[PDB]
Amino acid sequence: SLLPVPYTEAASLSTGSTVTIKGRPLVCFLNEPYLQVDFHTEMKEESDIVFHFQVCFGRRVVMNSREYGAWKQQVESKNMPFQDGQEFELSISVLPDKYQVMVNGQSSYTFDHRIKPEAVKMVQVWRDISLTKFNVSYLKR
Amino acid sequence: SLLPVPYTEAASLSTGSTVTIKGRPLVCFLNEPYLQVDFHTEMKEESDIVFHFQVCFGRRVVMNSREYGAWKQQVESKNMPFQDGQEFELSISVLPDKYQVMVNGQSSYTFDHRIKPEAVKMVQVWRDISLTKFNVSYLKR
Ligand SMILES: OC[C@H]1O[C@@H](O)[C@H](O)[C@@H](O)[C@H]1O
Ligand SMILES: OC[C@H]1O[C@@H](O)[C@H](O)[C@@H](O)[C@H]1O
Ligand SMILES: OC[C@H]1O[C@@H](O)[C@H](O)[C@@H](O)[C@H]1O
Numbered sequence: 001s002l003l004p005v006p007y008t009e010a011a012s013l014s015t016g017s018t019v020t021i022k023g024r025p026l027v028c029f030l031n032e033p034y035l036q037v038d039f040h041t042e043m044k045e046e047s048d049i050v051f052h053f054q055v056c057f058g059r060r061v062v063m064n065s066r067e068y069g070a071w072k073q074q075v076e077s078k079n080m081p082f083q084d085g086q087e088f089e090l091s092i093s094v095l096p097d098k099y100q101v102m103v104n105g106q107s108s109y110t111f112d113h114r115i116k117p118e119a120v121k122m123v124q125v126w127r128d129i130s131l132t133k134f135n136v137s138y139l140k141r
Numbered sequence: 142s143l144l145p146v147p148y149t150e151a152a153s154l155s156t157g158s159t160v161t162i163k164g165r166p167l168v169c170f171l172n173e174p175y176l177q178v179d180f181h182t183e184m185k186e187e188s189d190i191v192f193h194f195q196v197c198f199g200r201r202v203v204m205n206s207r208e209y210g211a212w213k214q215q216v217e218s219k220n221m222p223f224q225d226g227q228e229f230e231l232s233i234s235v236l237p238d239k240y241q242v243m244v245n246g247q248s249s250y251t252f253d254h255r256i257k258p259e260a261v262k263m264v265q266v267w268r269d270i271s272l273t274k275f276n277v278s279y280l281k282r
């Protein structure tokens with residue numbers, strides 16, 4: 001039972017928040033489907049991006065921020081724990097100094113805070129996936 | 142009234158065939174939505190690609206072929222007739238020596254045949270668009 005994609009949810013983050021996503025690539029890895037997760041400063045999709053996470057399935061991952069409309073220093077990883085044809089579970093944790101990205105229970109990517117996570121007002125999940133689960137935790141002070 | 146995306150239709154092409162697509166990018170150009178159109182040799186999406194057309198809206202266009210599983214020589218264009226937030230009409234014509242790509246009635250891209258267009262059995266239209274129209278002409282001998 002699938003959420004609409006692109007998926008937009010208002011959100012707040014601080015140290016101890018987790019964003020958990022469960023989905024499936026729409027097509028085989030040979031065709032290089034993408035997944036993107038963006039942490040935005042406003043509900044508007046043209047707003048700045050505290051954390052940009054983009055998977056080219058089978059190839060690579062890039063992370064960046066978009067600050068006053070401009071992309072900053074791109075970070076690239078060849079790490080590819082995602083499995084061709086499989087549902088994945090992605091969890092993004094706010095640590096004190098960085099985001100930690102777990103794929104199917106394995107630490108795969110981290111990204112030091114360029115902007116306080118308190119700036120985040122919105123998460124968008126989009127590109128070439130079906131989405132069965134999206135959750136932000138809110139238990140912590 | 143929207144076709145499903147990814148959109149797959151069985152197709153045959155020869156000299157004089159036109160593929161016409163009407164759609165809209167799902168998000169603003171600042172977020173770099175993609176459009177891809179692939180002319181496949183089989184109904185299977187892992188099959189070879191006679192003509193690969195990929196738009197990064199606002200940025201560039203790449204064209205290529207995938208032959209026995211391997212991408213060949215990429216062709217890149219900075220030509221960007223697509224308008225931020227607008228519905229587009231894309232028509233791909235089979236000329237004797239090449240594909241001609243019209244965007245909103247303007248010749249924008251061409252790509253010389255690497256494989257006879259008669260090899261095409263399937264068209265796939267996918268990535269970050271809504272799709273209102275897909276048509277292959279079949280009037281010619
Ligand atoms: O998704 C679009 C953007 O992805 C970023 O990682 C990159 O820094 C930008 O140049 C742009 O490509
Ligand atoms: O911000 C860029 C850096 O982010 C860190 O969290 C990570 O440990 C490094 O691998 C590098 O990605
Ligand atoms: O869409 C995926 C492919 O696009 C092609 O143009 C390119 O030659 C390949 O390297 C791959 O990037």
Ligand SMILES: OC[C@H]1O[C@@H](O)[C@H](O)[C@@H](O)[C@H]1O
Binds near residue numbers: 216239251252253
């Ligand atoms: O095949 C590569 C070439 O294709 C032709 O049709 C076109 O005139 C050139 O611009 C170049 O794109």
